Every structure is written in structure tokens, then in C-alpha cells.
UniProtKB/Swiss-Prot annotation, chain A:
Clinical disorder: Amyotrophic lateral sclerosis 27, juvenile: A form of amyotrophic lateral sclerosis, a neurodegenerative disorder affecting upper motor neurons in the brain and lower motor neurons in the brain stem and spinal cord, resulting in fatal paralysis. Sensory abnormalities are absent. The pathologic hallmarks of the disease include pallor of the corticospinal tract due to loss of motor neurons, presence of ubiquitin-positive inclusions within surviving motor neurons, and deposition of pathologic aggregates.
Family (UniProt): Belongs to the class-II pyridoxal-phosphate-dependent aminotransferase family.
Organism of provenance: Homo sapiens
Entry superkingdom: Eukaryota
Coiled coil (UniProt feature): none
Section of the entire sequence shown: 10 to 53 of 473
Protein name in the entry: Serine palmitoyltransferase 1
Swiss-Prot record, chain B:
Result, substituting residue 130 to P: In HSAN1C; reduced activity with L-serine as substrate; increased activity toward L-alanine resulting in the accumulation of 1-deoxy-sphinganine
Cofactors demanded by this protein: pyridoxal 5'-phosphate
Impact upon substituting residue 82 to A: Loss of catalytic activity with L-serine and palmitoyl-CoA as substrates
Mutagenesis / variant outcome for changing residue 307 to M: In HSAN1C; partial loss of normal activity as measured by reduced formation of sphinganine; affects enzymatic affinity resulting in the accumulation of the alternative metabolite 1-deoxy-sphinganine
Effect recorded for residue 451 to R: Loss of negative regulation by OMRDL3 and ceramides
GO molecular function: pyridoxal phosphate binding; serine C-palmitoyltransferase activity
Matches recorded under SUPFAM superfamilies: PLP-dependent transferases
Pfam families to which the protein is assigned, alphabetical: Aminotran_1_2 (PF00155)
Oligomer status and interactors: Component of the serine palmitoyltransferase (SPT) complex, which is composed of SPTLC1, SPTLC2 or SPTLC3 and SPTSSA or SPTSSB. The heterodimer consisting of SPTLC1 and SPTLC2/SPTLC3 forms the catalytic core of the enzyme, while SPTSSA or SPTSSB subunits determine substrate specificity. SPT also interacts with ORMDL proteins, especially ORMDL3, which negatively regulate SPT activity in the presence of ceramides. Forms dimers of heterodimers with SPTLC1.
Gene name linked to the record: SPTLC2
Originating organism: Homo sapiens
Full protein name: Serine palmitoyltransferase 2
Membrane topology annotation: Single-pass membrane protein
Curated annotation (Swiss-Prot), chain C:
A GO cellular component annotation in the UniProt record: endoplasmic reticulum
Topological domain spans for side Cytoplasmic: 1-21, 64-100, 140-153
UniProt name for this protein: ORM1-like protein 3
Any GO BP: positive regulation of protein localization to nucleus
Swiss-Prot record, chain D:
Species annotation: Homo sapiens
Span covered, complete protein: 235 to 311 of 562
Designated name of the protein: Serine palmitoyltransferase 2
Inducers of expression: Expression at protein level is highly increased in brains of patients with Alzheimer disease. No changes are observed at mRNA level.
Family: Belongs to the class-II pyridoxal-phosphate-dependent aminotransferase family.
Result, substituting residue 70 to A: Reduces the dimerization propensity with SPTLC1. Does not impair enzymatic activity
Effect of residue 68 to A: Reduces the dimerization propensity with SPTLC1; reduces the dimerization propensity with SPTLC1. Does not impair enzymatic activity
Disease note: Neuropathy, hereditary sensory and autonomic, 1C: A form of hereditary sensory and autonomic neuropathy, a genetically and clinically heterogeneous group of disorders characterized by degeneration of dorsal root and autonomic ganglion cells, and by prominent sensory abnormalities with a variable degree of motor and autonomic dysfunction. The neurological phenotype is often complicated by severe infections, osteomyelitis, and amputations.
Distribution of this protein across tissues and organs: Widely expressed.
Length: 44, 492, 153, 77
């Protein structure tokens, strides 16, 4: 709780930036409702 | 569609602890397989495998090593359960030649001793027609003495005989369809006649559990193949809707045809197809039906006409009625029944009609005698007794196994009883222990089945008596206590 | 046993990740690896967590992205001798509950190990380069692409 | 007919209806546009005297078919 907050405060800025972009990535993945098929085709 | 009689089937779920232990075992096997491969590659341990000749060492390697991984590391360890030679008629009791291996199943040597009187639960004789002494055997012997064994030409050429026409008309009367045609192999039936019916631009809808012959026949023809879930009419209905609506994938045009491939009884799963709902769907969406009846043509039905008699339906609703004589009638072969126009088209455009040798005469005589016995033309009461005994044995065996606490799959009526083991070592253990107690069974593994689900299948018969079934059931109970194979939460 | 005896799938491999209890087994495997690492006396807790993350990521990379093909002979006539396991999964459907879980769990392990490593710089760079090594192939853009022709054949 | 405007406005709807395609120039008179609107046909506009545009529109119309459910057009005018 409080100790965790203090430890997070002790960390550099780039590390928290990376953790934030990663949690954003997790949110994007968990809400990536679209299921692509990954196929490419065109008419002859 | 509605069912005149109740439709009971149970597929219990795997307990979570058993699943976790299953994955533990498979992980251990994978790790030790990788270690064994590493040892063999560096020649630290000599490999007991055949190697290519020196003259061809610079050629590209014939096989890919990774593909054989499961064969060397897991299949070889328990290889002794399969390919068991026999030296007797495969009746209710069979004689199995004994073999021993001193290099951990890599090579087998046959000791002199032969095991006698093994209770047979692996053969497919449902109505017990596999006898070395009987009326069918005498008729087959007479036709063998007259016609000889085997024909040396093709049906469209001089190879067509009168016995084949007699068999075809008898089969047509038996099923209730207008016409039927006979082939010399059940696998070849599908593989060679699905391509004729359907070609490029048509759609094929296949179950998840179709036999390899049906899948191969679908592949050989150019049709698109889409797989719906096992006995899920929601999936079948959704696939039919989307196929009719959206059309072909590249250029959205109507499909020329839609063919639904299904089976009467699925041997491994034990389940019976929901035929009334399939017929209703095919009537609503104007799709054709292909029904494989290898396992249900003799076993099911009040008299034995198949699934269509079991449900009480009309044979004219099924477009194509495939079937095999190997399982129930006791002789190798295959057939397709349907309309006269369909049968004539097959007579002209079937691959096996044009290129493949026709059936042997003694086999068709054996089929004729067996089928006449089943429909009762001879007048002997053997026809009804075999079917009634098969039904009684099925119900008794399934009920008394379910009341011991085992997990069993499929309907209550199907004469195939898949017991579930769930663990890779228990497959080999069950096979060896059952053989040690004079019972022969069939076990399957991971590449064949889903990873968690490993099973042993029992094929009941009309030749098994109450004493034989009681002996088998007490031995199964003892083994299940020994291996702890009763995973059923509902019953103990 | 032979492929296709009791099911019609050409490649059973694609579904081994959707089976029942596989996720719980994966989690218990990570936990067991962590406990085995804790069993070492001289090793300290932050480097224990660094070793846990590194070993997990290495093994997961080896299995999912290095080994290609199928351990058993398959009747589709070699669709996937060139494809790796990640590409094989679910017949190439790019998102799925299994894929989401597999790509989410390394990030959770990374957050835990960053917390327990006292946010040190050396451990941060090691853990982050490992996490990038695992997470870069998971991108849908990197499907069936070999950089500098490694593991193509 | 007793009016030139009424000719188009009253006889384009008779020839073509719903499910057919109408290809119009960029500079068509108001009567032709009104007649096309009154009938339920889909209207697509190609550039003025650009036979590349007309050819491309004809190709795509024949190939892809109707927008909602890709079926052949009944007619193309
Ligand atoms: C790509 C290859 C992937 C190999 C993964 C190895 C996993 C197995 C492992 O870590 O432990 C194995 C080593 O494993 C070995 O030493 C085997 C090394 C590869 C052998 C390749 C054989 C074909 C050439 C040994 O595992 P164990 O301690 O016997 O349990």
C-alpha cells in the first residue's frame, strides 16, 4: 500500500513511462475484440 | 424434427486435477524425448533404427526427423498393445500368439506359447457372424469350389458376374432403397465415390469426427470443406445459413451443391447422429445428405436396417446411403444405395467401377447368406435372436459399468463403450493388465484424440453371453481399483 | 496413435492451447519454477525474480517461436513444416483468448519482477530486453517473417 | 409527348426500376437526373466524356454486383 507507493515514487521516470505504455498495451489487447484472419487475396 | 423415443447421451467432463496430472505426464515425456534425441544424435547411445544405404548418403534425407518424434519417444514405449497377431477365428474367444521384446519394444520375437481363450472386445462382429463352422461357411465353400477365389478383371470389362447382380438386388431389397451398388473395399467406397458426386464449386459440410475415408474423399474432390461441431445442429444450421447467404469466398456466387457428410454411429465417441434434425435442416435449406452406416447397419434397429429404422424415419429422405459389410455381416466389402438414376450414374462414373477389380465371389456368397439370415428368408429364428441379444448385452454392460463409477461416452443404445483413462501411462498399463487377465481391448492416445481424452473402446457382440460379460465386468472392476480409473463424480 | 483415428483435425497441435486445464497447468509451472529458484541458498530475492523472468522468457521463446513443425506426422501433407507453433495456433487467427493470455502473462511477470527487483538499472535493462524479445514476435505484423533468413528453412 | 421535361421524368421510371443500375454523366440535364431519382435504381456518376471512367464503372458493376447482397444487376442503363 503506502510502501508500494513510496517504492514506485523512488523509481525513475522512463520506467514508469514504460509501465504505463505496457498497461495501455494490455488494455488494447484485452479490448481488441476484432479477430483478423490474416489472409491476402485478389481477383485474377 | 422430433424423437419418438428419448435420446439419452452423457459426456462427463474431465476433473481438473486429472487434467493437471495429464499435462505433467506429457511434459515429462516431451523432456525425456528431447534428451533421448540429443543423446542419439551425438552417437553417445546407439540408435536401433534402419539407415539409408551408403550409395544414397548424399541424397536429400527421405524423412523429417521431427515428424517421427512421437513415434520413437512415446509410441515405441507402449507399442506392444497394438498389432497383436491372432491365429483363430475372431469370435467371442480368440487365440493370440505371444511375443516378447528385450530391447524395449524396438523388436519383437515370437515365443512358442500361444494364449488361448482370450475374451475378445476388439473385433467388430456385432451380430456374431464370424464363425468357421456354419451355413454361411458351407455356402462360401461351395461357391469357392465353383467360381474360384477372386476375379481377374473389372466390372465394366469382362469382370462382371451374375453373383454381383444378385448381391446388388438383395442389398437394394434389404435397405429399402430402389437400387444399390457393391464395391470391394469400404475405404475405397468413399474415397472413390465422393469425388464423382461433387466437384469444384460445391460445398461439403463435415462433422468433427468423420472417418479418414470420408475426409480423403472430400479432399480428392475440389469442393470446399467446412467443419461443424460434433452433433451441434446450431453449428450446422449456422453454417448452412452463411453458406447459402454469402456464397463462394472469392467471388460471391451461389454454390452449385451442398453435401452433408455424416455417420450413423461414431465408433470412438460412441454417439449416434441426430438424424431427425439433420433431415429437417437438409429439407429446409435444400442440401443433400451422405450417410455412412458402417457401424449402424447391423447393430441398430428393431430388425437391423440401420439408423433409419432405429429412429423410424424414411429411407427415401437420405440421398446417399453408404455402408460396409465388414463390421456386422462378417465379410469385406462396401455398398452405396439410393435412387436408380444415382446408381446408374455411379455405374458409369465411379472410379472403382472403371479401374478397380470387382469383389471376390466367396465373399459375396457369404454376404448373401448372412443378409438372408438377418432378414429371415431362410425362416430360422437366428435373425431376431442375434439383434435382441446384442441389445440386451449393450444395455447390461453399459449400465453395470456406469454403476461402478467409470466415465463412459455416447448413447445408451450404441454397442461401442469407450471407457476413459485420461493419462498416457495408464493407456499401456490398462492394455497390459487386461491382457494379463485374458481380456483383449483397444486403447488410443494423444495424436488420435484430444490431449486430455485417452480411451479404451469395448465392442460388444451378440456372441457374448451373460457369463462372459460378468467375468469381463469383474476383471474391469479389479483393474479399475488397481489403476484408480473411476473418475465419476455422479456415481461411485 | 495415428492422427485422425478419433477426430477429423489435420493438425491437433493448433488446439493443444485451448484444452481444459492447460492455463492452470501453465501458471502452476511458472510457480514451481519460481519455488525451485527460491530453493537455492546463496541467490538473493531480486536476482531470483530476474532469473525467473529470464528462464521463463527463454523457454517460452524456444517453444513458441523457435521450434517449427509438428512432432507427429499429419495428413494435411505438410501445411506447417515452415510455420512455428505461434503461427500454427488456431489456424492463423490473430487474436484469441489463448493468444491474449499467452501474450499478457509475460507483462504481468515483468511488472512483478520490476517491483521486486527494487527498480535497479541493470535488472531493468535485462528484464526489458527479455520482454521485448518475447513480445516482438507476438505482433500480428510479424507473421511468417524471418529476419536475415534465420529459421526460414 | 407534350413536354420535353416530362418525357424523361415520366418514361425513365417505366423502363428501369429497383435492382437495376443507372450510369449518368456529370453534366446530365435536370430532367434526366429527376427521372433517375424517381425510379428506384442505383445511380452512379462517371466523369464527363471519360470512357476510362465509364469502362471502369461497367467492369466493377458487372463484377461486384449489388452493394448490400452481391447479386447480378437486372439491367444497366
Ligand atoms: C530447438 C531445440 C529445442 C530443445 C529444447 C530442450 C528442452 C529440454 C531441456 O531443456 O532439457 C533436456 C535437454 O535438452 C537437450 O539437451 C536437447 C537439445 C536439443 C536436441 C536436438 C536433437 C536433434 C538434433 C533434458 O531434460 P532432462 O533433465 O532429461 O529432464
Amino acid at each position: 500500500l503506502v510502501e508500494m507507493v513510496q517504492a514506485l515514487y523512488e523509481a525513475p521516470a522512463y520506467h514508469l513511462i514504460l509501465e504505463g505504455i505496457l498497461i495501455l498495451w494490455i488494455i488494447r489487447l484485452l479490448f481488441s475484440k476484432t479477430y483478423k484472419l490474416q489472409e491476402r487475396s485478389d481477383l485474377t | 424434427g422430433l424423437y419418438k423415443r428419448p435420446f439419452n447421451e452423457a459426456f462427463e467432463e474431465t476433473p481438473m486435477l486429472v487434467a493437471v496430472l495429464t499435462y505433467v505426464g506429457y511434459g515429462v515425456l516431451t523432456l525425456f524425448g528431447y534428451l533421448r534425441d540429443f543423446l542419439r544424435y551425438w552417437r553417445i547411445e546407439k540408435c536401433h533404427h534402419a539407415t539409408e544405404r551408403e550409395e544414397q548418403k548424399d541424397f536429400v534425407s527421405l524423412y523429417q526427423d521431427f515428424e517421427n518424434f512421437y513415434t520413437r519417444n512415446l509410441y515405441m514405449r507402449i507399442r506392444d498393445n497394438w498389432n497383436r497377431p491372432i491365429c483363430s477365428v475372431p469370435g467371442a474367444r480368440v487365440d493370440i500368439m505371444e511375443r516378447q521384446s528385450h530391447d524395449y519394444n524396438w523388436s519383437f520375437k515370437y515365443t512358442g506359447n500361444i494364449i488361448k481363450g482370450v475374451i475378445n472386445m476388439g473385433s467388430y462382429n456385432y451380430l456374431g457372424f464370424a464363425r468357421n463352422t456354419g451355413s454361411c461357411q458351407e455356402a462360401a465353400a461351395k461357391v469357392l469350389e465353383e467360381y474360384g477365389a477372386g476375379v481377374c478383371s473389372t466390372r465394366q470389362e469382362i469382370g462382371n458376374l451374375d453373383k454381383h447382380e444378385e448381391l446388388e438386388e438383395l442389398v437394394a431389397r434389404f435397405l429399402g432403397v430402389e437400387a444399390a451398388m457393391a464395391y470391394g473395399m469400404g475405404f475405397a467406397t468413399n474415397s472413390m465415390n465422393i469425388p464423382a458426386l461433387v466437384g469444384k464449386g460445391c460445398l461439403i459440410l463435415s462433422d468433427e469426427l468423420n472417418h479418414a475415408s470420408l475426409v480423403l474423399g472430400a479432399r480428392l474432390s475440389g469442393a470446399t470443406i467446412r467443419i461443424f461441431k460434433h452433433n451441434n445442429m446450431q453449428s450446422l444450421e449456422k453454417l448452412l445459413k452463411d453458406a447459402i447467404v454469402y456464397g463462394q469466398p472469392r467471388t460471391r456466387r451461389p454454390w452449385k451443391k451442398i453435401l452433408i457428410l455424416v455417420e450413423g454411429i461414431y465408433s470412438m465417441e460412441g454417439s449416434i447422429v441426430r438424424l431427425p434434425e439433420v433431415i429437417a435442416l437438409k429439407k429446409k435449406y435444400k442440401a443433400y445428405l451422405y450417410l455412412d452406416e458402417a457401424h449402424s447397419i447391423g447393430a441398430l434397429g428393431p430388425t437391423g436396417r440401420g439408423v433409419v429404422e432405429y429412429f423410424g424415419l424414411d429411407p427415401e429422405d437420405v440421398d446417399v446411403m453408404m455402408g460396409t459389410f465388414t463390421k456386422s455381416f462378417g465379410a469385406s466389402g462396401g455398398y452405396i444405395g439410393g435412387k436408380k438414376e444415382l446408381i446408374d450414374y455411379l455405374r458409369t462414373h465411379s472410379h472403382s467401377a472403371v479401374y478397380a477389380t470387382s469383389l471376390s465371389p466367396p465373399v459375396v456368397e457369404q454376404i448373401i447368406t448372412s443378409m438372408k439370415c438377418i432378414m429371415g428368408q431362410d425362416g430360422t429364428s437366428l435373425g431376431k435372436e442375434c439383434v435382441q441379444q446384442l441389445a440386451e448385452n449393450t444395455r447390461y454392460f453399459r449400465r453395470r459399468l456406469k454403476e461402478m463409477g467409470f466415465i463412459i461416452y455416447g448413447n445408451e443404445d450404441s454397442p461401442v463403450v469407450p471407457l476413459m483413462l485420461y493419462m498416457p501411462a495408464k493407456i499401456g498399463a490398462f492394455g497390459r493388465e487386461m491382457l494379463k487377465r485374458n481380456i483383449g481391448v483397444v486403447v488410443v492416445g494423444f495424436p488420435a484424440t484430444p490431449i486430455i481424452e485417452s480411451r479404451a473402446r469395448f465392442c460388444l457382440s451378440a456372441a457374448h453371453t451373460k457369463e462372459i460379460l460378468d467375468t469381463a465386468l469383474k476383471e474391469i472392476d479389479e483393474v479399475g481399483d488397481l489403476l484408480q480409473l473411476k473418475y465419476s463424480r455422479h456415481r461411485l | 496413435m495415428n492422427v485422425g483415428t478419433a477426430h477429423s483435425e489435420v493438425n491437433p497441435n493448433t488446439r493443444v492451447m485451448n484444452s481444459r486445464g492447460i492455463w492452470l497447468s501453465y501458471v502452476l509451472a511458472i510457480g514451481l519454477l519460481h519455488i525451485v529458484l527460491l530453493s537455492i541458498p546463496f541467490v538473493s530475492v531480486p536476482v531470483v525474480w530476474t532469473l525467473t523472468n529470464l528462464i521463463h522468457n527463454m523457454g517460452m521463446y524456444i517453444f513458441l517461436h523457435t521450434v517449427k513443425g509438428t512432432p507427429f506426422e499429419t495428413p494435411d501433407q505438410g501445411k506447417a513444416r515452415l510455420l512455428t507453433h505461434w503461427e500454427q495456433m488456431d489456424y492463423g487467427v490473430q487474436f484469441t483468448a489463448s493468444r491474449k493470455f499467452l501474450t499478457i502473462t509475460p507483462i504481468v511477470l515483468y511488472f512483478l519482477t520490476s517491483f521486486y527487483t527494487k527498480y535497479d538499472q541493470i535488472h531493468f535493462v535485462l528484464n526489458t530486453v527479455s520482454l521485448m524479445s518475447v513480445l516482438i514476435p507476438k505482433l500480428p505484423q510479424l507473421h511468417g517473417v524471418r529476419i536475415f533468413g534465420i529459421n526460414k528453412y
